[PDB]
Amino acid sequence: VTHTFHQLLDMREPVFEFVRPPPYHPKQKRFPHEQPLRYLDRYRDSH
């Protein structure tokens, strides 16, 4: 197939794979009003 695509078809070999969705990111609040560390601790990675 590489020979066919390059020699006579004269093109780069097409390569495909399942496209994954964009990463999901939580949207933290700029000012955590009345937000403690224990509650934020669970939400944040550190815990």
Binding site: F5, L9, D10, M11, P14, F16, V19
Partner: peptide, 22 residues
């Protein structure tokens, strides 16, 4: 080159493509 033009994602319509791939 006209041949180089290729879509970003492939279009496989074989019913057993997924089954054969697993």
């Amino acid at each position: 080159k006209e041949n180089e033009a290729v879509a970003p994602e492939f279009t496989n319509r074989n019913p057993r493509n997924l089954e054969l791939l697993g």
